[PDB]
Design a protein around this motif. Sequence first.
Motif, PDB file in Angstrom:
ATOM      1  N   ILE A   5      34.722  38.434  52.246  1.00 57.24           N
ATOM      2  CA  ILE A   5      34.335  39.837  52.520  1.00 57.24           C
ATOM      3  C   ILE A   5      35.615  40.642  52.553  1.00 57.24           C
ATOM      4  O   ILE A   5      36.843  39.953  52.642  1.00 57.24           O
ATOM      5  N   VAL A   6      35.381  41.871  52.108  1.00 60.13           N
ATOM      6  CA  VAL A   6      36.503  42.846  52.150  1.00 60.13           C
ATOM      7  C   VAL A   6      36.220  43.932  53.178  1.00 60.13           C
ATOM      8  O   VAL A   6      35.031  44.544  53.104  1.00 60.13           O
ATOM      9  N   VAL A 105      32.029  45.407  52.119  1.00 60.71           N
ATOM     10  CA  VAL A 105      31.610  44.719  51.083  1.00 60.71           C
ATOM     11  C   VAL A 105      31.602  43.020  50.830  1.00 60.71           C
ATOM     12  O   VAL A 105      32.608  42.565  51.233  1.00 60.71           O
ATOM     13  N   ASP A 106      30.463  42.765  50.432  1.00 60.80           N
ATOM     14  CA  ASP A 106      30.567  41.186  50.370  1.00 60.80           C
ATOM     15  C   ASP A 106      30.724  40.846  48.917  1.00 60.80           C
ATOM     16  O   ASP A 106      29.920  41.137  48.033  1.00 60.80           O
ATOM     17  N   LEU A 107      32.006  40.107  48.626  1.00 63.75           N
ATOM     18  CA  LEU A 107      32.591  40.058  47.315  1.00 63.75           C
ATOM     19  C   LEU A 107      32.150  38.717  46.759  1.00 63.75           C
ATOM     20  O   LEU A 107      32.522  38.011  45.934  1.00 63.75           O
ATOM     21  N   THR A 108      31.268  37.787  47.506  1.00 65.89           N
ATOM     22  CA  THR A 108      31.218  36.183  47.672  1.00 65.89           C
ATOM     23  C   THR A 108      30.582  36.046  46.049  1.00 65.89           C
ATOM     24  O   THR A 108      30.996  35.306  45.235  1.00 65.89           O
ATOM     25  N   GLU A 109      29.483  36.707  45.702  1.00 65.12           N
ATOM     26  CA  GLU A 109      28.903  36.488  44.373  1.00 65.12           C
ATOM     27  C   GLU A 109      29.910  37.113  43.418  1.00 65.12           C
ATOM     28  O   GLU A 109      29.798  36.646  42.192  1.00 65.12           O
ATOM     29  N   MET A 110      30.437  38.337  43.359  1.00 62.50           N
ATOM     30  CA  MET A 110      31.226  38.854  42.559  1.00 62.50           C
ATOM     31  C   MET A 110      32.394  37.940  42.128  1.00 62.50           C
ATOM     32  O   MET A 110      32.967  37.903  40.909  1.00 62.50           O
ATOM     33  N   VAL A 111      32.985  37.363  43.154  1.00 67.64           N
ATOM     34  CA  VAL A 111      34.073  36.455  42.962  1.00 67.64           C
ATOM     35  C   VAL A 111      33.752  35.146  42.192  1.00 67.64           C
ATOM     36  O   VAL A 111      34.487  34.794  41.343  1.00 67.64           O
ATOM     37  N   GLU A 112      32.498  34.749  42.521  1.00 67.88           N
ATOM     38  CA  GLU A 112      32.180  33.315  41.717  1.00 67.88           C
ATOM     39  C   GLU A 112      31.984  33.767  40.465  1.00 67.88           C
ATOM     40  O   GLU A 112      32.455  32.928  39.449  1.00 67.88           O
ATOM     41  N   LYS A 113      31.544  34.856  39.860  1.00 64.81           N
ATOM     42  CA  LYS A 113      31.325  35.077  38.559  1.00 64.81           C
ATOM     43  C   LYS A 113      32.721  35.187  37.879  1.00 64.81           C
ATOM     44  O   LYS A 113      32.999  34.751  36.615  1.00 64.81           O
ATOM     45  N   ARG A 114      33.490  35.844  38.565  1.00 66.29           N
ATOM     46  CA  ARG A 114      34.958  35.947  37.981  1.00 66.29           C
ATOM     47  C   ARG A 114      35.575  34.694  37.538  1.00 66.29           C
ATOM     48  O   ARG A 114      36.224  34.514  36.621  1.00 66.29           O
TER      49      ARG A 114
END
Length: 377
Positions: A5-6, A105-114
């Motif tokens: 999370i951010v 903002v929930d970055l969990t999904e955006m992180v996994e992709k990166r």
Amino acid sequence: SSRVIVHVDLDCFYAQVEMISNPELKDKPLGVQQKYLVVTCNYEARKLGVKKLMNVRDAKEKCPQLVLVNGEDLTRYREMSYKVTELLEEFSPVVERLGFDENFVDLTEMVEKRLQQLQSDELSAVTVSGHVYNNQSINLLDVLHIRLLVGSQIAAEMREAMYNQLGLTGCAGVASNKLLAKLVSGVFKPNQQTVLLPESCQHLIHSLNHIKEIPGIGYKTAKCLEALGINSVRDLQTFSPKILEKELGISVAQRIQKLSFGEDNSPVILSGPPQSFSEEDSFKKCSSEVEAKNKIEELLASLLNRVCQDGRKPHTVRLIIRRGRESRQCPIPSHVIQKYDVMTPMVDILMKLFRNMVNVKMPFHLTLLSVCFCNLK
DNA sequence: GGGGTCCT
DNA sequence: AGGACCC
Ligand SMILES: Nc1ccn([C@H]2C[C@H](O)[C@@H](COP(=O)(O)OP(=O)(O)OP(=O)(O)O)O2)c(=O)n1
Ligand SMILES: [Mg+2]
Ligand SMILES: [Mg+2]
Ligand SMILES: [Mg+2]
């Protein structure tokens, strides 16, 4: 599963907007004024003694050369409030607002992709943007450290975008839940960001002094615990559950103790459009139906303007009165949702509420009146 | 004080 | 409708 999370926090919000509005303040120590107070102020003016929520008299006595602007019109402020939120939604759709100057903002999904696009080779290349809390050494072999460092980079991107595109500076906090993200975001101010690794989770919660510093433990709940001889985070961490459950109820007890450990499993909610609108007014005395009427007319005026814009329409209105609040509400009649007079029929309804709630025949004294539109379709 | 959420 | 939290 482990989240990322951010939390985003805009440096002295109203302060920033005023400057960005009238540049002829960038150079000058400034405070936004709500009534008799200074509810915020730029950092230039923080140097000269000024402090959030300070009395304006003492203010100038503390900083003779202190400029003053009025932030009793929150209209300029929320346009930016949402420009910020919209800016962030472009990153990940799920963005939770908190007040006007805070976002989750929930970055969990955006992180996994990166990462799921990161050659196993360049894996050691991963680095951090901003501060690492408690200067804790990075361990790149620990996937959890990896997912959080990426987290910091996205944050840095988000903060640059806010600046390049909106001209706003802010702080960011990246951790494994909303609680820690929130807490770690203010370790370095202003206009800087901090990330939290899990091994330093306990250091951060204990750095807190008063127990009411943790998000969620507010006025009431503190006084409840202060009464129980609970003052530190460890006091609360070590207190007997069952006694707490008995004293706070199983709902609260269970949650707010988890919070003492830094455990928060509440999700980032998507805020979307505002569920409600409202205008407030408090005061020393008000003992007349007629002057109530005057206030109730003003407030109604101000609201009809935003309620106007927006789009969707309100299907319920309410009235709130402090004499410890109490409220009444009822559907707005179908023909009323229609904008060409709307005032008089409104005040008619509102007064009806304001009369079943109050006994006018008799004397009465309110220190506050509010009007709220909601149930928007 | 002056907006807004959510739980119940 | 009221009570808590957040800012
Ligand atoms: N009880 C409160 C708390 C604050 N505010 C206002 C003043 C701030 O401009 C805004 C948000 O408060 P913050 O705690 O986020 O303060 P800032 O982000 O403006 O200041 P800082 O630079 O210290 O982070 O809401 C208010 O009216 N009533
Ligand atoms: Mg803040
Ligand atoms: Mg801030
Ligand atoms: Mg708190």
